[PDB]
Amino acid sequence: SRQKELTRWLKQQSVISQRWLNISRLLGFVSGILIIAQAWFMARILQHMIMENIPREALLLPFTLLVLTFVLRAWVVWLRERVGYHAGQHIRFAIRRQVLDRLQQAGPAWIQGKPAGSWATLVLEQIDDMHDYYARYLPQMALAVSVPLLIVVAIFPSNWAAALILLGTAPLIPLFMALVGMGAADANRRNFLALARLSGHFLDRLRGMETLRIFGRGEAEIESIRSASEDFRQRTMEVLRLAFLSSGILEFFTSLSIALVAVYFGFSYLGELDFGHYDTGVTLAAGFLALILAPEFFQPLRDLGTFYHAKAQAVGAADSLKTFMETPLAHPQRGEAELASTDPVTIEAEELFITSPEGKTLAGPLNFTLPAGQRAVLVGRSGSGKSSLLNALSGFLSYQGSLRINGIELRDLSPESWRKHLSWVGQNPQLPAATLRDNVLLARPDASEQELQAALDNAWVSEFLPLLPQGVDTPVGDQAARLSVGQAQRVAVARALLNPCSLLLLDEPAASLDAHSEQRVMEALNAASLRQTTLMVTHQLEDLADWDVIWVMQDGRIIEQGRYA
Amino acid sequence: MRALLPYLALYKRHKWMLSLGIVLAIVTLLASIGLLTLSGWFLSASAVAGVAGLYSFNYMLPAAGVRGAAITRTAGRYFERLVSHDATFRVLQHLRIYTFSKLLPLSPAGLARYRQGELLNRVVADVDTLDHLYLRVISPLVGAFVVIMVVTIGLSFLDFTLAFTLGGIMLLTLFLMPPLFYRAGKSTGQNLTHLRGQYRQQLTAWLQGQAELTIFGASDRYRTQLENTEIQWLEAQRRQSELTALSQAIMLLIGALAVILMLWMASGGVGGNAQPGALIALFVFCALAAFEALAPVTGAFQHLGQVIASAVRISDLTDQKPEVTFPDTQTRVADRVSLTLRDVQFTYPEQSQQALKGISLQVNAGEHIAILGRTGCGKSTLLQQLTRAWDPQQGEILLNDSPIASLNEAALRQTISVVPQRVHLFSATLRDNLLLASPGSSDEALSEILRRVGLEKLLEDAGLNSWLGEGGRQLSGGELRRLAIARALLHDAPLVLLDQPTEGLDATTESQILELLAEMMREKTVLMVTHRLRGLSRFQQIIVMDNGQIIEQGTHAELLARQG
């Protein structure tokens, strides 16, 4: 029911490159044609020099044509799966553009739900799992039905008995695979649970080696790895005695067919058997055509067996991708209005509900007014939706209710132009630029260096500049070039203060910071919260006396609205 | 290369199962070649003989060969797949034990410089691809070489100049095509792997920074260079799919040259025979059927590079020296601790922080020291030296008037039972999670201790048979904290180091644990390291420290006056 529905999804995706998946079917038919042409030419040559003892140079025309059939086959093979890659690249490129468009539009609220490592397996590993299905499986799934049928059609005019040995095994191969498939699927459910908890046993023990040492179990979990590896082998070797029986059935019928073709033709030339030929004595050339083509008959079905593993992983990777694209999403309405002025704005709210992308309401009915250019700290209990109001003002969360910015409803405001008057300082510092010089200039990358220096010392990011190796342009990538938490946060402050803003939001800037940086972060922000209307969510109740308004938020509601009285 | 030298010694433990899996690969390939070569000759020999030569021609022997070669082709491939996969799983056990025996003595220190996220997932993916050296590389390369040799030797009984051109061409592509294509696709293999991890870090920093990119308008132009990395990355995957196209097209042309040469040369004469007759098809059908031995060869050698890649990414990770060494003095753990560290000035590697500025404190047996310091104080670094994750420089730590270095690892781990801040669920049965502390504990003792701690919801159903960790009964914070304490109670060490026991717990659980600690860990020297001020009133001593220095010490009071 589901696995059938996922396969239908994989077909809907394979439409960008339907042109490239038709030339893999066409070149499969052409490559099939060239096998008979090769096989027929070789039989014509071989019969002439064996039976009629024709010299080498009188067969110079079939040799010249046999070379072409060999060069053409090599060209088609090179051409066939370059088309196959081009097909599979276009699904991966088009879907990865749909996934990113689904994440960019969903916003940071939906993105933050899962770790960024689990998002980058969806965009990298899940999508690249689907290449070898449109590139190698689907083209081969149709070369496995044309080439075997095209070979039999070529042999049938020669003999109806040599083309019946090959066509005789056509129903038997899937019939015997089903008989061995019952035993295999029995062992795939009995041993499925045990092999799911034994496959991740090594990484389980390999992680948490810090707990193994502190209790002295380092030498006693080597024995566990010895028993979890001897038990994973025994169970897999039970599954594999049946997975190599189904595979070896096709190898049984491809050698029975060659044995039968060789015996039937060999005995027919001697006179024991005379039923196959159409009342005309079977020729040597008619036996070489069938013997050369007997292995080529089963090769397409053999390759399909190797590429069939890509069928399963492209369906599993289509489960993660499909449900990702079928999750309903509530995202903020794209407005069209703009802000008349960059003068600090006035916030107003009445019976405001903030809706998660999941669909639930994080902050209940809350009403407040924030006059222009007045700091207002928002302190409350943990988990009470205090950070949700900051997201809703940034445009990351969709709200049903009334939230108007400077007299204009936030829904009508165009996000591209609303966020030109907005600045934010998050709790955890997230630097997305390559170099520390471009992180500060993230707001505008062409700002004058003289202005930049006035922004660097304002946030006191320059005091720890000499400690960094390269100075201002020190690489800040997360790997091997890091800064201190209180250092990568003081550069987030400089990024926020580089460009003046109408509304400035602070989401617990001084969290998990050393006491040295926390002093310099706050008094850099405590002077930056007066020029424009500021809405801060702080964990520390201390030293908020010089804050115009305090809102206490319990269970997503403004209960205690006071002035630190 | 030579990076495989330590790992080829693990394959030598099972060398008769790997050899049997290669001999069966040679036999299966010789049966495939023999079946078609005998079939090609049988058709030609009988057709030439015709009806007239029926009685003179002995067809029973060639008819038994095709039946014999067909059976050993099907049974040989079934048993070659079984024996070679079975030997692969046996070596996998030796690769895992070897990797785990090496990464264990450097578990806290050596792996700290890397990141635990990718490092631990890379080791599993590199051990898995070292295990496939035999199937992907050795079996196709050595199976083909012996098949080429036996075919060449066998065909030399008919004509010497024909066996050495079919064998010569076949050998000249077993040794030339794999290296000429590994060398041709070496830049792409480097370029593709670099661009894959470059797109990964540009995507993670685009997703994690989506809140700080959207506001400042860089979300569009930081995706534009993210999609330009993919364009470069996809162009380095096509160039790798054009080396597989060229290798399959060339292998089809070389197997075409051998067939055409056999049609031309063998028709001239086979073994000093003007009219070879049926011997033309024996050589032509040998050239046709001998090039599926060389089908795996060219993709096998590129796999050697990946195995070389993963054989050095582990052989430098497992060859870095342990930070500390434990002399096997065979000491005996005492019933009391009396921990004392005269002076400990310790500094991290590649860090000028020097978290311990030379601190000093003395703990008597039975005391309940409770070190207090705000975040970033390096207070947990003190608990690292006591378990000897790092040894201090110019420091003296004594344990019952004997230095911590003198104790062997077998006794140090039994002397000190630490509850870590991150407690790891082992994804095993709950009985196997707590027997980690004390292996000899009886089944009754497990239920009692798990009762006294307060984890009764675990023993309600399948208490010692339930599967905890991944794919099982996961535990929550504060319900997993009682597991860390439960293990420390089984371990029954005289000293108990607690690292933030109540870091993230609500009021009701934190109050229980503080009483849970004091009631049971009463006769045991306890050194508890927290940044919380609640339960210090029951501790016989409190140490208040900042930036690795003791400011307020000797305060038998509930907490630092200013801290209150």
Numbering used by the authors:
A (entry chain D): 4 to 568
B (entry chain C): 1 to 564
Quote the study that presented this structure, word for word.
Of the two constructed Walker B variants, only CydDCE500Q could be isolated in sufficient yield, purity and stability. The nucleotide and substrate-free, inward-facing conformation of CydDC IFasisolatedapo, obtained in as isolated conditions, exhibits canonical features of type IV ABC transporters. In contrast to the turnover dataset of CydDCE500Q, biochemically defined CydDCE500Q cryo-EM samples revealed conformational heterogeneity reflected by structures of IFasisolatedapo, IFconfinedheme and Occreturnapo states.
